[PDB]
Design a protein around this ligand. Structure first.
Ligand SMILES: *[C@@H]1O[C@H](CO)[C@@H](O)[C@H](O)[C@H]1NC(C)=O
Ligand SMILES: *[C@@H]1O[C@H](CO)[C@@H](O)[C@H](O)[C@H]1NC(C)=O
Ligand SMILES: *[C@@H]1O[C@H](CO)[C@@H](O)[C@H](O)[C@H]1NC(C)=O
Ligand SMILES: *[C@@H]1O[C@H](CO)[C@@H](O)[C@H](O)[C@H]1NC(C)=O
Ligand SMILES: *[C@@H]1O[C@H](CO)[C@@H](O)[C@H](O)[C@H]1NC(C)=O
Ligand SMILES: *[C@@H]1O[C@H](CO)[C@@H](O)[C@H](O)[C@H]1NC(C)=O
Ligand SMILES: *[C@@H]1O[C@H](CO)[C@@H](O)[C@H](O)[C@H]1NC(C)=O
Ligand SMILES: *[C@@H]1O[C@H](CO)[C@@H](O)[C@H](O)[C@H]1NC(C)=O
Ligand SMILES: *[C@@H]1O[C@H](CO)[C@@H](O)[C@H](O)[C@H]1NC(C)=O
Ligand SMILES: *[C@@H]1O[C@H](CO)[C@@H](O)[C@H](O)[C@H]1NC(C)=O
Ligand SMILES: *[C@@H]1O[C@H](CO)[C@@H](O)[C@H](O)[C@H]1NC(C)=O
Lengths: 915, 918
């Protein structure tokens, strides 16, 4: 039937558990390395590790050791890109080291680290240059494989550091960094490896960022500037000057993310409305500035704190094929596109299986749907062209219950069902053999494999003892590796499976049949290019070889309506109801308007509403090219005219050096008339004020309110600016008028007396007591009560102009008391100022006389003569019943016995009860 | 009958008019000078002058001239005090000069002036030292009779410059000046001849430096709420003057600091009418009440006057006018202000029926210093150069009036009053009150002359001249010990002056002997001889004796002391008399008690408290016993903390985080050495200090988190306990604001203005709203306001916001229409799903709607305005302007809305519709 070999190997170290990282190194070397690492729970995440090395297809592993003292290698060991050099890092309790090897891990030389470690990053082409992120947010660099080190930046952000492009930027030693400047600022720096001392420079002028520097592998550079009202986003093509990215003007953005800047254009996702659910997919032009709509809604989750994810996948086998998941209402649908985002379509159902009754769904009512990147407790692989295998549902939407493994071998044109429940999938020999293992918690020893692209499957016992399946790997050939811990023991075991005994013959050039790449409409001209791949013949058993030849038949097509899409500000009308696709101009934008900050001398390029698909290679010249070659920019009218006083302004005292400053925005080319009126008769006309750079002096004589009016007049437009100023300076003193003592739940009339009588514009801050934030009042008087007893501080603050006066006063709040009203004589009013000291002394003398006439305690009588113009008094009698005797005694000592007052020479005042 | 000589002289220069100044010079010289000056009307006041000199009792005047070019000497020529030196000043059009003479005006030497002139001032004793006030407010000085000059100060105040005392201050070259410092400050300088400056304490002043001839010095410090006044005795440290604590003062004025005490007048309540007369102690600090109400007017702009007069004949006799309700009464005192009494009526005259007033119902009243003259003349001044002679005009009844002016006199210092003249008369004393001359003050010409030799009991008339003369002025020989009178005036408007020198010496050839005088004991209205604890007796010339009182007059020879009695003591600071006067004792008033310590009593010093009684200052009664009440109280306790104040440097309104905040603390009433200063800045920073107010250095702090904080300070002593609080706010960031307003709306339509700020709900914000033509804005605490527009056209609406100490401001232009028609508009429900409140979205939607309406009706586009409102349900208003045929347009628009659907392509495959709205 079949023919294969299985070789098992157990890691002899029984002290093995948790995780492991297995990696090959180089081609035509046959050397494999394994790192067995032990994680820790309860937020510990501390590690213990062991190293294994093989040099014979992974059949004999030796456990490597380093010195009598065993160094604990951390999880991350870094290989050199493109060049076989290995670096291992170690971490303990605040003590670290490194190990270097240039002999495929044969001789590890130890070196120390004079700093912490978090991650590393090599150079794309230079094998010996590498930089390091120090855990306390530092950036070091080394050009000698990390033997010696030097310092660069000290406040770098997490994982926003990138090397220069190999092909672009002309400089291989550039380092783009994002770092914290000032207190609460972030800026984008650019240094060199050897000289970062004073050589860096700043490409963006302003340089504020909320941690969002991003430069993808290709030629584009991005920047995210946070602002006051609405944030902005800038872009740089070929490291040129930055330009503000053009999004839909009124589709306001919240967050955005760069999905893929592949080939010559950019794909971005922008969440418009804060649904925390749906994103919109937009596509740019060559420079990455003019963005247009592509897809409406896509799923979005926040798995990690800083990392968000968007349900979209590029098929790496065929360039220009994308899959996505939309969410409308509460329904999750799946769509796929071959036109690189122009037109999306649903998935074609298979309607067949090994146990598939054909009563299942038809096109019109329910389709196929797939789980892309989200696994509600999934892998979709694509290493070979046209082979797309994944788990999904089949119906009107996706659900969490059903997980069925479907596959397609012709890039989505023909779908077929294979497995029930999820299965780990592995391709071998450029999609020559497809292996699958059931993902489950129970142990097993089975193995599914297919040779005819998923049409006929075969089972085989690859081992004897059942093993828990942990992972599958393949050679950078037909060597498969299955690693996992067995049922009985808890130690690791690897099984190397060799399919090379079967079909030993090498494929010739005539052993493949041609398969033309089509779409769901049967059209061959995809992206203006007819493509055809090679598929192994069913009646042929051979190995596809060291290098696979495919996509040999590639022809060009003539340009058609399907090869053009809408530009910035244009959308498809009626969903192409009339005939075919038509890009009509939406309401918000018209092609007449100039772009933001068009400066004279430069030339912006407007569009007619149609643009060729980027990287489409159809026969150009004719066929609705619509290349405008529009170079123009018009003269600007005076806009954003601003007038102010030097500093924070809006406060003046008479006879003071007031300095007025004026500023403009759009342009200084035209001669401008500046008419100026300062509201006090001073009329004056000036010219070239914004270009002169000199302020205007003025001194106001009379206190009052004034209005400054300025008019800027040109041949293009006409603008006006106004500024109201107040000159109200003198504030001498204030006073808080308040009763010195009052009972609980009694209405208190607080008053704020100022030096000028009823000032026109005053604000009052009132501080009651324990409550911190004060009350705002426009009137002099307020009314308040006291629920608590004891002593309370009442504070008042006033500020007419830019000067503040403030006064506090302590008041007593009683509880056990009796109230007695008191009339005074009429003559006293002729010698009664509102001075509180006079009132206090009058109350003291009245209390003294009452104590002399009743022989009762003096501290138990409180006299308050009030602030009213008619002299009215209140007598509070405390208890701490016998209180009736004291009350009667006081009433008799008031009525029957006159309480006399010697005010001035020959003037007597009397006090009695008050109705 | 009588015997006298009259010698007339006419200034031969017929070109003479306007004014003249006549002055003598020296004794035993017989030299007189006259300066005839000609003023000019119509705000000109430019002068032309001539000089006359005589050397024989004014019988032969020579018109002096100086050089071929006649220099016009201005009004002021200055003589040397005490020393015969004369200085003349000249003025032209910005060119001046001076003339000096040391030979009684025999040889005038000319010198120039390198500056302007306004007034001069000599030294009390140094004849060659003199200072000058330059018109543009400068002060120059010269020690060589004004030949050479040097500069002192450049911003001096008008007539507040004084020389040092001759007896006091130990320094003769001191100059006390008041000058303007900084911008809007005034200070008191003390300068010397060689260079100018301050040794004594000083501050801000509102032009009120005053140093009377005697040993006292005063100062008036203006403050914020209530001003203060300081005093300095014998040029010592200044002390705050003690007035009644609750009798609040408005203005005060120093009347007389004569002998050993001070008299001040203080207006308590702003009646612009009555002042209160107060008396001080030796140092001039503890003031007590003396008199209640006195008249007060503002005749000149800077000069005020108070109706009170000191009798220069007898020290300690004062006259005053009180005003109660609307009645003006007159009072006099002999006790130097202790007890006042009304005037005794005469009840007799040459034509005096005795039915006139009696004591109980109506008295005598006199016009002291006030001349209410609706008609011609009527000006009254009461003079007293001789002891006991007081002559003046007044009324007789219950009060003073403007009508009646009758000249009364008293020769025994107010004990016996007598009526003399009807209507006013100029009066002149000769030979220490030996001959009394009088001339009727009137507009008509006259040639009569009244004179009396028996102290105003028998009067005689005499034709002193032949032709009737207009009476201009009267003068006498220096010393007032001769009998030469001089009457000057122009005769019958003959355009020239005439002087008449009258000599009474023929009738009085004898020199008085020591036995030609009779004794007159000085008494009061009660007949008591012990006045001021001193029996006094003066000399009066006998009626049967014709002699000249002589070069020097001997009087008050009998002066004996009396034993101290109740009448020789008065109340001290804070004590008043019980019941009323002339009835029933210095009792302590309510506001002050003798327990309290004085202001700023420092440990180690000893203040002297009082019992409520003090001896009349300068009373020389037999002391030792008789209620002396000399306490000899030397003690001082520690003072409690009073007037604790805490603030930020300057007028800090608001603060931003991470800023240099400087806190300052100060005390006022009293100072204490050991002091606890507890301090809490409301952000966890607790700290205790000592000697904060004495160090004088602020405290630095930087707030980190924005918010509101409270600074609390506590001063703790063994005497008391004080606390000071200061609330501060740190609310700095204001990024941007926006005025949300409909771009256009009709007349009398309710407009909802809104002010959007960067924070959605800022806690404490004030909003200033500027509607349009009205200047003063409206104040608001809420974001939104509602207003209308009565006028049409274009209107600017402005809004201003200020949370902390930062201001944001935004304006917007709105259109107000008149000829319009309103159409409501429903939008589709789907549109609400893509409708943000961004105004640009709304404006573009309105623009597209207007475009489609213009395409569907072919009517003008500018006459259709679409406003889609800010409401969450999308509602639109369409305004159709006229500048009838408007019905056709309205019907066309309604049909183009209903019958023809107005489509809107929002997004790919989404159509919106608009129609009419119920
Ligand atoms: C690598 O190995 C393959 C097959 O083993 C061989 O064809 C190839 O030539 C080798 N590479 C080189 C550079 O020789
Ligand atoms: C960089 O610095 C080194 C010294 O550290 C110096 O020799 C070299 O010339 C510098 N290179 C540049 C480009 O500044
Ligand atoms: C400045 O003023 C000159 C003449 O007043 C005018 O020609 C010019 O256009 C103005 N603006 C400039 C130089 O930018
Ligand atoms: C003052 O208190 C009285 C009595 O409680 C109250 O009627 C009045 O409204 C208060 N406020 C005033 C008078 O402004
Ligand atoms: C002035 O002269 C007279 C007459 O000789 C003489 O009595 C008198 O004493 C002189 N004056 C003085 C101040 O001596
Ligand atoms: C005048 O001189 C004194 C001491 O000679 C000096 O203190 C003072 O400052 C001088 N005046 C001025 C204005 O400098
Ligand atoms: C002046 O004298 C004449 C007689 O010589 C006399 O009739 C007259 O009354 C006197 N008085 C006046 C004012 O004429
Ligand atoms: C505190 O202030 C007093 C002044 O009352 C001073 O005498 C003393 O030396 C000061 N102590 C200090 C500064 O330590
Ligand atoms: C008010 O001020 C406090 C500062 O303590 C701040 O935390 C709060 O956000 C502000 N606004 C409201 C509505 O409390
Ligand atoms: C103004 O605002 C109020 C709510 O504060 C609303 O009820 C009213 O309809 C608004 N009126 C206009 C004319 O906008
Ligand atoms: C931001 O700008 C919009 C205009 O698009 C304005 O309506 C709004 O008031 C501004 N401020 C805030 C806080 O949104």
């Amino acid at each position: 039937q079949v023919s294969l070999i299985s070789t098992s190997f157990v890691l002899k170290g029984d002290a093995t558990h948790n995780q492991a990282m297995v990696h090959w190194t180089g081609e035509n070397s046959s050397v494999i390395l394994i790192l067995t690492k032990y994680y820790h729970a309860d937020m510990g995440k501390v590690l213990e590790s062991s190293l294994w090395r093989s040099s014979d297809f992974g059949t004999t592993y030796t456990k490597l050791t380093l010195q009598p003292g065993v160094t604990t290698v951390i999880d991350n060991f870094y290989i050199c890109p493109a060049k076989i050099i290995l670096v291992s890092s170690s971490l303990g309790d605040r003590e670290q080291s490194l190990f270097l090897s240039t002999d495929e891990g044969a001789t590890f030389q130890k070196y120390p680290v004079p700093f912490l470690v978090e991650t590393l990053l090599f150079h794309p082409k230079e094998e010996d240059k590498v930089l390091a992120y120090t855990k306390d947010s530092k950036l070091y660099v080394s050009s000698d494989l990390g033997k010696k080190w030097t310092l660069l930046q000290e406040r770098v952000t997490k994982d926003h550091v990138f090397w220069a492009v190999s092909g672009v930027d002309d400089d291989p030693n550039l380092v783009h960094v994002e770092a914290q400047d000032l207190s609460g600022g972030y800026r984008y720096y650019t240094c060199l490896i050897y000289n970062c001392s004073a050589q860096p420079h700043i490409a963006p002028f302003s340089g504020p960022i909320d941690r969002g520097s991003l430069t993808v592998q290709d030629e584009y550079i991005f920047l995210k500037a946070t602002s006051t009202n609405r944030t902005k986003y800038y872009v740089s093509y070929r490291r040129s000057d930055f330009v503000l990215m053009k999004l839909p003007k009124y589709a306001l953005p919240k967050d955005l993310q760069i999905i893929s800047t592949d080939e010559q254009q950019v794909f971005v996702a922008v969440q418009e409305w804060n649904q925390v659910d749906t994103y919109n997919l937009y596509q740019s032009d060559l420079r990455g500035v003019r963005y247009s709509l592509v897809l409406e809604n896509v799923r979005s989750s926040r798995q990690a704190e800083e990392n968000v994810v968007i349900d979209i996948l590029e098929v790496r086998g065929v360039k220009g094929v994308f899959l996505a998941n939309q969410k409308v209402d509460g329904k999750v649908t799946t769509v796929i596109t071959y036109n690189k985002g122009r037109d999306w379509d649903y998935l074609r159902p298979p309607s067949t299986d090994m146990n598939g009754k054909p009563t299942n769904c038809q096109p019109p009512d329910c389709y196929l749907h797939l789980h892309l990147r989200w696994a509600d407790n999934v892998h979709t692989k694509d290493t070979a062209p046209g082979l797309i295998m994944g788990a999904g549902n089949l119906g009107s939407q996706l659900v969490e219950y059903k997980e069925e493994m479907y596959i397609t071998s012709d890039c989505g044109h023909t779908w077929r069902q294979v497995f029930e429940e999820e299965h780990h999938v592995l391709y071998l020999d450029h999609g020559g053999v497809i292996a699958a293992i059931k993902d489950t918690s129970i142990p097993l020893k089975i193995l599914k494999f297919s040779v005819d692209e998923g049409h006929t499957w075969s089972t085989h016992n690859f081992t004897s003892t059942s093993v828990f399946v942990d992972g599958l790997l393949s050679e950078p050939t037909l060597v498969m590796t299955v690693f996992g811990h067995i049922s009985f023991r808890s130690d690791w075991e690897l099984v190397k499976v060799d399919f090379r005994p079967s079909f030993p013959r090498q494929c010739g050039e005539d052993d493949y049949s041609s398969w033309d790449l089509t779409d769901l409409q049967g059209d061959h001209c995809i992206m203006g290019q007819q493509r055809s791949y090679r598929k192994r013949k069913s009646t042929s058993w051979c190995v596809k070889g060291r290098s696979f030849t495919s996509a040999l038949t590639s022809r060009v097509c003539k340009c058609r309506d399907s090869d053009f899409l809408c530009d910035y500000g244009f959308e498809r009308s009626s969903s192409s109801e009339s005939t075919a696709n038509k890009c009509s101009a939406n309401f918000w934008f018209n092609p007449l308007s100039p772009p933001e900050d068009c400066v004279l001398g430069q030339t912006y390029t407007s569009s007619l509403g149609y643009r060729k698909v980027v990287s489409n290679v159809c026969e150009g010249g004719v066929d609705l090219q619509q290349s405008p070659v529009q170079l123009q920019c018009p003269l600007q009218a005076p806009r954003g005219l601003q007038v102010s006083i030097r500093g924070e302004a809006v406060a003046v005292r008479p006879r003071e050096d007031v300095l007025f400053v004026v500023r403009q925005e759009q342009g200084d080319v035209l001669t401008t008339k500046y008419q100026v009126d300062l509201g006090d008769g001073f009329k004056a006309m000036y010219v070239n004020l914004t270009l002169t750079g000199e302020p205007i002096r003025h001194h106001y004589e009379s206190p009052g309110i004034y209005r400054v009016s300025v008019r800027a007049e040109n041949m293009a437009g006409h603008d006006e600016a106004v500024l109201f100023v107040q000159v109200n300076s003198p504030l001498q003193a204030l006073y808080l008028e308040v009763v010195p003592v009052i009972g609980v739940n009694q209405e208190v009339n607080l008053t704020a007396v100022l030096l000028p009588l009823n000032p026109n514009l005053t604000v009052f801050y009132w501080w009651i007591g324990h409550s911190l934030q004060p009350l705002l009042s426009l009137d002099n008087s307020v009314t308040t009560k006291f629920t608590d007893a004891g002593d309370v501080r009442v504070t008042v603050q006033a500020a007419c102009g830019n000067s503040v006066l403030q006064d506090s006063r302590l008041v007593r709040v009683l509880d056990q008391f009796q109230v007695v009203p008191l009339r005074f004589s009429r003559e006293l009013d002729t010698f009664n100022p509102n001075t509180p000291e006079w009132r206090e002394d009058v109350g003291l003398v009245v209390t003294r006389l009452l104590s002399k006439e009743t022989s009762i305690p003096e501290e138990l009588l409180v006299t308050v003569v009030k602030p009213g113009l008619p002299t009215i008094a209140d007598l509070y009698v405390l208890l701490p019943l016998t209180s009736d005797k004291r009350l009667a005694a006081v009433q008799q000592a008031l009525n029957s016995h006159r309480i006399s007052f010697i005010l001035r020479g020959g003037l007597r005042i009397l006090v009695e009860l008050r109705d």
